[PDB]
Amino acid sequence: PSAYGSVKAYTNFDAERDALNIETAIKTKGVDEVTIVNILTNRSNEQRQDIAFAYQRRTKKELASALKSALSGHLETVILGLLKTPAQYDASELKASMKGLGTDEDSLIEIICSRTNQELQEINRVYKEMYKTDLEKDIISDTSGDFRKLMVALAKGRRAEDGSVIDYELIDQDARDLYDAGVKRKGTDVPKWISIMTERSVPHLQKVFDRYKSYSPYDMLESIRKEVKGDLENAFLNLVQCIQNKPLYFADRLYDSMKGKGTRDKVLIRIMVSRSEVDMLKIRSEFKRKYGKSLYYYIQQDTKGDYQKALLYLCGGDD
Amino acid sequence: PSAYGSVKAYTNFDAERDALNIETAIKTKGVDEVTIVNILTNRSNEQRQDIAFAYQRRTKKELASALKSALSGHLETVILGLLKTPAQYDASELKASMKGLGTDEDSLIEIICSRTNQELQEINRVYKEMYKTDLEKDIISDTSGDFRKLMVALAKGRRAEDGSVIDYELIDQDARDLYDAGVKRKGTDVPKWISIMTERSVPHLQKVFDRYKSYSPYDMLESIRKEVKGDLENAFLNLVQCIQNKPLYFADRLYDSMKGKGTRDKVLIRIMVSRSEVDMLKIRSEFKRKYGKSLYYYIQQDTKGDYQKALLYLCGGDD
Ligand SMILES: [Ca+2]
Ligand SMILES: [Ca+2]
Ligand SMILES: [Ca+2]
Ligand SMILES: [Ca+2]
Ligand SMILES: [Ca+2]
Ligand SMILES: [Ca+2]
Ligand SMILES: [Ca+2]
Ligand SMILES: [Ca+2]
Ligand SMILES: [Ca+2]
Ligand SMILES: [Ca+2]
Ligand SMILES: [Ca+2]
Ligand SMILES: [Ca+2]
Ligand SMILES: [Ca+2]
Ligand SMILES: [Ca+2]
């Protein structure tokens, strides 16, 4: 169990009682959204599975579809998201980003770039069972060129596992190689860049990016903005952020989702849901440090209603 | 479904008739090995299955069991081998290689590196279906290290599968990558090697190896002999030979089993049996081309008795 999540297993818990309470609030006049939120936002993801199992034993009807009926708008999205397992959620999100004409580059990049080997292995499995097809083949189908190559590599989830040993020689070499394949020469050797950033372990790459500043006038992120463009650039920039500092990566995505006019609800929700039981505490930490005010504070200003309430619960506090 | 095999189905078949003559030969005084070979080594594997059935039905005893008792030495091994189905044979040999302290690396490598996806799948099914445990597990328990990773990957039999289109860009990239991962750098990146050599299709790798010769002063085989050692080396050398020219791979194996004093009978017998209905013609072709005389010739010189005849029948002709 991750210690940096914001949402934790409810101390004293009973699935069957929750199921009853949920249904009650669902049957009530005008629906008792408040209750449904108060319960689901304060139960771990695994406890939610049990509640969905119990609710079906009582009503013979699937909790998800029931709640889908009683709810609507952004709130519905949030709840239906908190009910799926992490892999199911991520799988459905990856499927959604590729559904129809076009590709939601942003969201495809976000998931594939931040998930770990362990998380990806489970996603590939669930994605197959859920959509009777492989994530890979789906990815190869909606993307092309170098972006496709990069996304396929990351989705494999075969990055080397971090070793107890620091390979200073390899770090330097990988550093020079990154400089030689880009800033140092006209054009770019994208395959070399891809090879290294997807195969080396994160800890190792973190040091590589540091050594890299010793050979290049520009750091990795900057060098990227200069060497590539389009979806490719977007991908590398996201991936490098996830390697250097993931909690920070998400705090920035969260900031971008609310900073301006309106709200990019699709992004805000996915993060608040998927990272609630992972590193929400570090994210809030990085967010508060960088922007001056709490994440909580931004959510208050950008959202309202039960929807807001839901998000503020997943946030955890820092009011 | 193997136009290049030397042993093909006997036209006027009669599982019954054959079964009878077998029983007669077995019950004859001193045992009539001559007619037993004359029959079994001229009937297709699928046919021998029917003969085994008709025989069991008539004697209430198992043909294999009967012959094991009636025969001995090298002949017994040849016959007992021919009675098992391709999958069953490979399975047993495979198991035979790992049973007992230590591991017969050569036998294990030969089978794992030369079998195609289809053949491997059926072996995986028939293996557990025989020793009540996944082949992979047995392999993992007997193997260790880089050697293990390679054997496990090959065993899965999930190599890319063979297309229409030649991917020139990928052929070059793989070659350059193989060099960058081996001869060009201090040490070796065994994972990248395993990755490329186990996941790309054979027609593709053949070109990869040719193109590789454009980056390195030494070809793949030689590069391997310099980059790695022990079982790992042994495996790679075999694997690459199977990719470049399988019939030649086997001709070379057959030649090594007889070139010197005595005879590595196990190897000779396994190849003669396991390849008799697959590519024995190309193997004989490649053999005569490289060594001057025919395979028939070498077998003739290295073996005698009824054992000799069986091998000569499995071989084909080309006196
Ligand atoms: Ca209401
Ligand atoms: Ca609804
Ligand atoms: Ca699409
Ligand atoms: Ca788009
Ligand atoms: Ca450049
Ligand atoms: Ca650019
Ligand atoms: Ca806003
Ligand atoms: Ca005799
Ligand atoms: Ca015997
Ligand atoms: Ca053993
Ligand atoms: Ca050994
Ligand atoms: Ca080397
Ligand atoms: Ca060596
Ligand atoms: Ca000899």
Residue B109 CB coordination number (10 Å): 24
Clarify whether residues B71 and B131 are in a common domain.
Answer: no
Radius of gyration of chain B (CA): 21
CATH number at residue B51: 1.10.220.10
Given B163, B185, B211, the domain boundary residue is B163
Q: Chain centroid to CA B168: how far?
A: 31
Q: How far apart are CA B111 and CA B274, in angstroms?
A: 10
Q: Do B5 and B79 have their domain in common? A: yes
3-state secondary structure chain B: CCCCCCCCCCCCCCHHHHHHHHHHHHHCCCCCHHHHHHHHCCCCHHHHHHHHHHHHHHHCCCHHHHHHHHCCHHHHHHHHHHHCCHHHHHHHHHHHHHCCCCCCHHHHHHHHHHCCHHHHHHHHHHHHHHHCCCHHHHHHHHCCHHHHHHHHHHHCCCCCCCCCCCCHHHHHHHHHHHHHCCCCCCCCCHHHHHHHHHHCCHHHHHHHHHHHCCCCCCCHHHHHHHHCCHHHHHHHHHHHHHHHHHHHHHHHHHHHCCCCCCCCHHHHHHHHHHHCCCCHHHHHHHHHHHHCCCHHHHHHHHCCHHHHHHHHHHHCCCC
Of B27, B111, B125, B43, the closest CA to residue B83 belongs to B43
**DSSP assignment letter at A162:** P
Residue A7 contacts residue A276 (beta carbons within 8 Å): yes
Residue among B189, B194, B196, B198 with most chain A CBs within 10 A, to mutate: B189
Domain total in chain B: 4
Q: Are B223 and B262 within one domain?
A: no
Interatomic CA distance for residues A107 and A112, integer angstroms: 9
Rounded to the nearest 5 degrees, what angle is found at the Cα of A118, between the Cα atoms of A114 and A122?
100
A101 and A140 part of one domain: yes
Q: Is the dihedral of CA B167, B173, B175, B177 positive or negative?
A: negative
CA torsion A225→A230→A235→A240, rounded to 10°? 0
Experimental approach was X-ray
- Between A and B, how many CB-CB pairs are < 8 A? 8
Nearest CA in chain B to A145: B169
Give the C-alpha distances (Å, rounded to integers) separating A294 from A273, A285, A318, B2.
18, 8, 6, 71
User: Do the beta carbons of residue B280 and residue B5 sit within 8 Å?
Assistant: yes
DSSP code for A277 = T
Angstrom CA distances, A269 to A7, A104, A151, A249, A308, stand at 15, 16, 23, 16, 10
| The pair of three-digit structure tokens given for residue A93, joined into one six-digit string | 């999100």
Do A154 and A137 have their domain in common?
yes
- Hey, are the CB atoms on A173 and B191 less than 8 Å from each other? no
B166-175 in b/e burial notation, b at 16+ Cβ within 10 A? Answer: eeeeebbbbb
**Cα within 13 Å of Cα(B66), Cβ side:** 21
3-class secondary-structure state, position B86: helix
d(CA A64, CA A259): 32
Interface of A with B in 191-220 (CB under 8 A): 191, 195, 199
Q: Are B139 and B151 in contact (CB under 8 A)?
A: yes
Looking at the structure, tell me whether residues A99 and A130 fall in a common domain. Answer: yes
Q: How far apart (Å, rounded) are the C-alpha atoms in residues A291 and A78?
A: 25
3-class DSSP state for residue A189? Answer: coil
Distance CA A272, CA A278 (A): 10
To which residue do tokens 């017994």 refer? Answer: B76
Tokens 């199921």 sit on residue: A19
All residues with CB under 5 Å from ion ligand 11: B 102-103
CB atoms within 10 A of CB B237: 19
Q: Could you say which ligand is closest to the alpha carbon of residue A184?
A: 5
The verdict on B260 and B225 lying in the same domain is no
Residue A183 sits in the same domain as residue A207: yes
CA neighbor of A315 nearest in space, from A251, A264, A237: A251
Q: Does B163 touch chain A (CB under 8 A)?
A: no
- Do B223 and B146 lie in one domain? The reply is no
Same domain, A77 and A4: yes
Contacts of B42 (CB under 8 A, 6+ apart): B7, B10, B313
| Domain carrying residue B289 | 246-319
Residues of B in contact with A199 (CB under 8 A): 191-192
Q: Which of B203, B223, B244 is the last residue of a domain?
A: B244
Q: In this structure, what token pair is assigned to residue A281? A: 């505490």
- Helices A265-274 and A105-114 cross at an angle (nearest 10°) of 20
Q: Are residues B66 and B299 in contact, defined by beta-carbon separation less than 8 angstroms?
A: no
Task: Say yes or no: A127 and A142 in one domain.
Answer: yes
CB of A87 closer than 8 Å to CB of A48: no
Q: How far is the CA of B98 from the centre of ligand 10 (A)?
A: 4
Residue A198, phi-psi category: left (phi > 0), alpha (psi -120 to 50), beta (remainder): alpha
Q: Could you tell me how many residues make up chain B? A: 319
| Closest residue by Cα to residue A17 from A46, A39, A38, A37 | A39
Query: What six digits make up the tokens of A90?
Result: 């991520």
Contact B51, B63 (CB under 8 A): yes
CB proximity list for A111: less than 8 A, separation 6 or greater: A90, A93, A94, A97
For chain A, the maximum distance between any two Cα atoms, rounded to a whole number of angstroms, is 68
> Are the beta carbons of B163 and B208 closer than 8 angstroms?
no
Q: With CA atoms as reference, report the closest residue to A110 among A239, A231, A205.
A: A239
| Three-state secondary-structure class, residue A82 | helix
Say whether both A116 and A186 belong to one domain.
no
- Final residue of a structural domain among A212, A244, A276: A244
Torsion over CA of B242, B246, B249 and B255, rounded to 10 degrees?
160
